[PDB]
């Protein structure tokens, strides 16, 4: 059920976040935005947790973007992985963060906090994302400036993607947000959207249910707050996988 | 001079050939087709050898395609590398296998035997290769059918390259050759070209110095034989790096 894959590269962003890549089974297929069970072998039972696949389905490796919880059963150990180590990966990806469950639209907003950024790494590398949308707004809301992950990638490297680059300079807009200190965009994503600061910064029109589509991935609080905002502006959720709406959303984690 | 990189993936083709990938230094730049010194740390002095870079310069990792010599000082050890191991990689790539040293042409023939295939893995992934040529003929001459490396990649996977695929189906022609047993294309590359079997199979015209360009990488014998053939047909070699000709060539190894 859970075959081992091998850890390739590992990068630590902060004391709380790190990324890693693994090998990918020949028969492993997924839709961009989906999550899969991953984990570790132990002295007893394997430790297994849901993780977004932070890479596109056309890519040769898998990537994961992970929290580090000091006493978390999985991540207390996962944080110490090294190239060559084994990480268990499931066979059955699933999840709600699918552009196929978004009604036709013009602007695609990817609203993520913390590790909620993970599925966006997949989505922004899907060619179909750009076939369907005029603008793709990539966000990450974090606490401090130093917490922003993949910043150089988004700001410098991705606009040079030998293959996606030309399109990305035209369509991909990066909007980092920081809560706990002064910054160009200071606040929760809900607050930056509530008074239209996000749209003003990006040069986009006031939110409109006919035009704007959302994918939302974050804390229980951010999901509740953003859903309340969008619902109050006339946006309708996708009610289940396979049924389209103006937005889709998925818990980045649960407060256990 | 020789910083360590980390081994990522390893694949054994036969008892005599294997491939591996490594991390790449942020400041490491190269022209497609070039070689670099690589090697291993030891109990004394590092073991260092010239290796073609078997990947394109736009890619995030390096790949190498290696012989296994039973009592070879480097490869007796290199064959046992595992994910996570360190491989030394030089800073100063060089070499003659540069499309920039080919006069304008129509068809690009990549004539390789054994590990001579390595630089072609770089060249066939360079977008500039296809800007400059109507057809790219990818060869590997080997002894037995089972020795052909990357066969599924060339025949099945590469024509589906999410980004290079459309172009490759149009322009990339794979021509495997085998000497020691019956096969669609049986013989040395020199022999398959001497009587035009290669051109007939591929549906290309008789060799013509105005139109056909060659990059040649292989054994001392194959280089001598192919140069004699091409020279007798009026093709002129590039005399040095930076001065263009109808063909370029480089030793895949030396008989020590
Ligand atoms: C659909 C889904 C997708 C998920 N995708 C990811 C992902 O891409 N990356 C990832 O790191 N985790 C993801 N998670 C959370 C993940 O399943 C684990 O909870 C996480 O690996 C921590 O495991 P643990 O055993 O160390 O801590 P656990 O005992 O699961 O969690 C303990 C506490 O850690 C905190 N926590 C757990 N995960 C996070 C998190 N991601 N961000 C902030 N705080 C967290 C919460 O306070 C939680 O109560 C996802 C969860 C679900 C349900
Ligand atoms: C410009 C250049 C590029 C090279 N690129 C590559 C490359 O991409 N991949 C690679 O494996 N080697 C390549 N080589 C050969 C390489 O430098 C080493 O010789 C090889 O790694 C074997 O090292 P060793 O110490 O094990 O054997 P060494 O003592 O170097 O060689 C001993 C014997 O092994 C045989 N041999 C060595 N290399 C090969 C080979 N590649 N194919 C068939 N027989 C060989 C010869 O009989 C040689 O006399 C290249 C050499 C040069 C000069
Ligand atoms: Cl929020
Ligand atoms: Cl030959």
Residue numbers in the entry:
A (entry chain A), B (entry chain A): 4 to 259
Sentences reproduced from the published study:
Ferredoxin-NADP(H) reductases (FNRs, EC 1.18.1.2) constitute a family of hydrophilic FAD-containing monomeric enzymes that deliver NADPH or low potential one-electron donors to redox-based metabolisms in plastids, mitochondria, and bacteria. Structures of bacterial FPRs, as well as those of plastidic FNRs, are folded in two distinct domains: the C-terminus with a binding site for NADP(H) and the N-terminus binding the cofactor FAD. The genome of X. axonopodis pv. citri contains the fpr gene that encodes the FPR (XacFPR). Despite the fact that neither the role of XacFPR nor its potential substrate has been elucidated, its involvement in the oxidative stress response of X. axonopodis pv. citri via interaction with ferredoxin XAC1762 has been proposed.
